[PDB]
Every structure is written in structure tokens, then in C-alpha cells.
């Protein structure tokens, strides 16, 4: 109990210091200058040069390193882009490098469907919109979103689980705190029909808890218990309904959650 007892002492000491009159006043004074510092430099941010310089240093490529894009800032950013932006023997071995492969068959098919498709372009779309939209719905029990994205096979598994909770009168209200590692793990052909799919992996920090529907008290998990779960998604695109507003064809054939471990 040495670690747990020391943590309570450390938490209480910080709590006493944070709630201390000197500490709270110092924090407020520091926070006030932060508002003044941002306000002083606010006209600089309005300059066209700052917009271009910031778009060079960051460009929005920092999202590879983590972060969760809130649902409101996720829908607005999407609709903004859609309005304007998105609107001898060695030689033989060298020859086999340039030969067609199962990964090349899969990626070429999705390029036929959308001429703009690439691994980098879809990983950006996955990371910024698709994966956060699906993970956030998954932890919060939002079956309206998952109906559009999940196929009839993985959704019927989900809606069967959501029926167990309704029987015991609990509702999922989880959180996603950070999503990392959003990548196209593999591109395979689902045999025997050779259905081109992309296997997508990620690692999301998340708080998994369920509250009783009638009262609201804790029914599972803990309000502060962060887990670093790994998600595997199998994505295919339907040539029909590629004009869909939300999914634009993309569909999830498999959704597996695994590798959950504690984090902070």
C-alpha cells in the first residue's frame, strides 16, 4: 500500500497547494497574464502572414501524434472543407519489386472508385474524421452513427450488446481522451470473392463507465480509469452510395477492440 498511500499524500499536498491562498492567487495572476498575452498577440494572429506561417509549421499534420477532435469541431471542420476545400537474378528480384501484389490490387480498386484516394489521403481522413467519429459513438452507445458505418455483421453484434445493457437499465457514457496510431495496417482481399478491404488500427485512450438509467450512479468501470485500448477496423467502400454525405461509401466490415491496458 506504499504506492497508494504515497499517492494520496501527493494528491492531497497538491490539492492543499492548489487550494492554498498563495497558490490560487498565483495561478489566477498567471492565468490573467495569459489572457492578456493572447489578447496582445491577437491582432498578429489576424494577419495573413500568421495564417500562412502557422499553416507551414503545423499544417494540421500534428494530428498524427495524438489528440481527440471534439464532435462539434469535427463536424464544423468537415463541412468547412466540403464547402471549399474538399468540394541476372538480382534484376529478376528487382522486377518482382515492381510487380502487382494483393496490396496493390486493393489500393488500385479504391483509386478507381475515388481518383483522389491514397494511403496518405485516407489515413488523414480516417485520423481526422472517420476513426474519432466511430470510436466516440462506440464508447457512448450511439447506435445512430454506428448504423451508417458498421455493416450488418458488426452492428448486429453491437446492437445485441446494447440490448443486454438495456435489460439491466444501464447506459454507456464513456469518453475518448486521445486517439493515436491511426494507420492503414494492411490492405487485403477478402477471399474467395477478392473484396478489397483496408485493415485500420489505432490506439485510443478512453474512460469506460456505465451509469444506471434511472438514478445515474456508477454501474461499471470508474469515472477516472483511463484505458489504452487498441482497435482493429476492416474498411471497404461500396461503389453505390459513394455519394453518401456522412460515410461516402466507406463501411466497416469488422470492428475488434483489444489490447486494453491502463494509462495516464
Amino acid at each position, epitope marked *: 500500500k506504499t504506492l497508494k498511500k504515497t499517492g494520496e499524500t501527493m494528491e492531497h499536498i497538491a490539492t492543499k497547494a492548489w487550494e492554498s491562498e498563495l497558490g490560487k492567487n498565483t495561478r489566477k495572476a498567471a492565468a490573467a497574464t495569459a489572457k492578456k498575452l493572447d489578447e496582445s498577440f491577437e491582432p498578429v494572429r489576424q494577419t495573413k502572414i500568421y495564417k500562412e506561417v502557422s499553416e507551414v509549421i503545423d499544417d494540421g499534420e500534428s494530428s498524427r501524434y495524438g489528440g481527440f477532435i471534439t464532435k462539434e469541431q469535427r463536424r464544423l471542420k468537415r463541412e468547412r472543407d466540403l464547402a471549399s476545400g474538399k468540394r541476372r537474378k538480382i534484376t529478376n528480384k528487382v522486377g518482382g519489386f515492381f*510487380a*502487382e501484389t494483393e496490396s496493390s*490490387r486493393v489500393y488500385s480498386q479504391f483509386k478507381l472508385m475515388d481518383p483522389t484516394f491514397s494511403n496518405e489521403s485516407f489515413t488523414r481522413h480516417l485520423r481526422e474524421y472517420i476513426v474519432p467519429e466511430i470510436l466516440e459513438a462506440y464508447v457512448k452507445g450511439d447506435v445512430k452513427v454506428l448504423k451508417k458505418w458498421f455493416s450488418e*455483421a458488426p452492428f448486429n453484434v453491437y446492437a445485441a450488446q446494447q440490448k443486454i445493457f438495456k435489460e439491466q437499465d444501464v447506459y454507456a457514457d464513456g469518453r475518448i481522451l486521445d486517439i493515436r496510431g491511426v494507420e492503414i495496417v494492411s490492405a487485403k482481399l477478402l477471399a*474467395p*470473392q*477478392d473484396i478489397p478491404v483496408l485493415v485500420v488500427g489505432c490506439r485510443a485512450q478512453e474512460i469506460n463507465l456505465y451509469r444506471k438509467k434511472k438514478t445515474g450512479e456508477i454501474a461499471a468501470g470508474d469515472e477516472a480509469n483511463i484505458l489504452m485500448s487498441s482497435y482493429a477496423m476492416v474498411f*471497404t467502400r461500396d461503389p453505390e452510395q459513394i455519394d453518401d454525405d456522412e460515410t461516402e461509401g466507406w463501411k466497416i466490415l469488422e470492428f475488434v477492440r483489444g489490447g486494453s491496458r491502463q494509462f495516464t
Partner: antibody
Amino acid sequence: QVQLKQSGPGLVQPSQSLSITCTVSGFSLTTYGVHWVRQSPGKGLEWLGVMWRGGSTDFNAAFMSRLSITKDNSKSQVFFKMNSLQADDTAIYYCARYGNYDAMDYWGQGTSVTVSS
Amino acid sequence: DIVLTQSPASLAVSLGQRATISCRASESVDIYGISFMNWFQQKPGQPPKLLIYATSNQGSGVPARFSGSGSGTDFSLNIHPMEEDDTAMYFCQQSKEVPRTFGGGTKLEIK
């Protein structure tokens, strides 16, 4: 480009064996599979068997006891065989490579087989 | 397996008009919501030619005048406008389950 070429015998004697070799070029048998399809005039197109992209075979249930499809990755050849032919087996035999969504995109020229004496 | 009933057995339309060929699978040919219905064309002395795959996707190099539609168990092929060239025998082929089965064929001509 992609090209499937067949080399089999016409005029097969009754109760004999039929052997078509489908020499492929432009693609490798490790990444693509080859359906084997037959077209009779009185029975229309019909599917005999397949060399799946992975290398396993699967046949029509009406011909499984007769068919035998084997490939050879190094030589880019697929071998087709039927143990016994009767007068109803006279037709044109195609090897059709299948791609995404099992689309038989490229076809062999066809082997016009006759079963008589 | 799945018995694809294809109608009409014969069809005659003039140049420039729309010719529609129907297929009716006995069962549903959908896997993951994608209907595996391929459409083929066969000139008299040549192997079949893939026109449509996955019920709507044009084959490599297939003219834009060949349209595939339908879902569930009812499918269609529309040639519009129809040229003098594409008079041939048209087949529907389900790729859902083994054995693969072809339609009876539709002989399409000129008036």
C-alpha cells in the same frame, strides 16, 4: 498486357480424358486466380472449377468427381483435366482470370472440344 | 446453386435507343451489402467479355453506355445509346457462392 492462352485437344474420344493447359502471361498465379468455365450450345455457360488466388481448388458439384485443376506458379500454367467425357461434354472450355469482386476480367480464347468417333 | 433467370430471352431494338436486359437471382447475391452480379457480353466467335462487375462497376475499358443496376435479387443491364456494334449475347453471373452460375443469355439485335 494480360493474356491467357490455352493448349488442349479437340476431338476427344468418348470415355477418355480432356486436358487443357492455360499458359498465362502478364500476371502471376500467386496474385491472381483462374476460373474454368464451359459453354455448351444446348446448356449455355457453366462453371467447372477454379484455382483460387491462394492456390486451392474448388469444383462444381456435378463435376467434382471428374475435374482436377492444378497449377504451376513458376511456368505460369494452370492445368485442367476431366477423367471421363461423354457426348454431353462437347463444348468450348475457357480459363478466365478473376480479379476484384470475382470479376472474370480476362478470358482464354477457348478450346473447342468434341466428344465423338 | 443460385438460379439466375434472365429475361427477355431475345431482344430487338433500333440504334440509339435504350435496351434493357434483366436478371432475377433465385437468392440474394449480397455479401457485405455488395451484390456480386457480373454482366458479360459474347460475340459469336469470341470468349465472353466482362462488362459490369459488382452490379455497377464498368469493366476495364468498357464503354460508358453499359449501365448495371439492381440489388437484392433483381438486376438490370442498360445499353444506351445502343450502337450497331454491341449486338451480342449478354449473361448475368453471380459471384456470391460456389458454384458460380450464369444466366440463360439474352440475344440482343438490331431492328
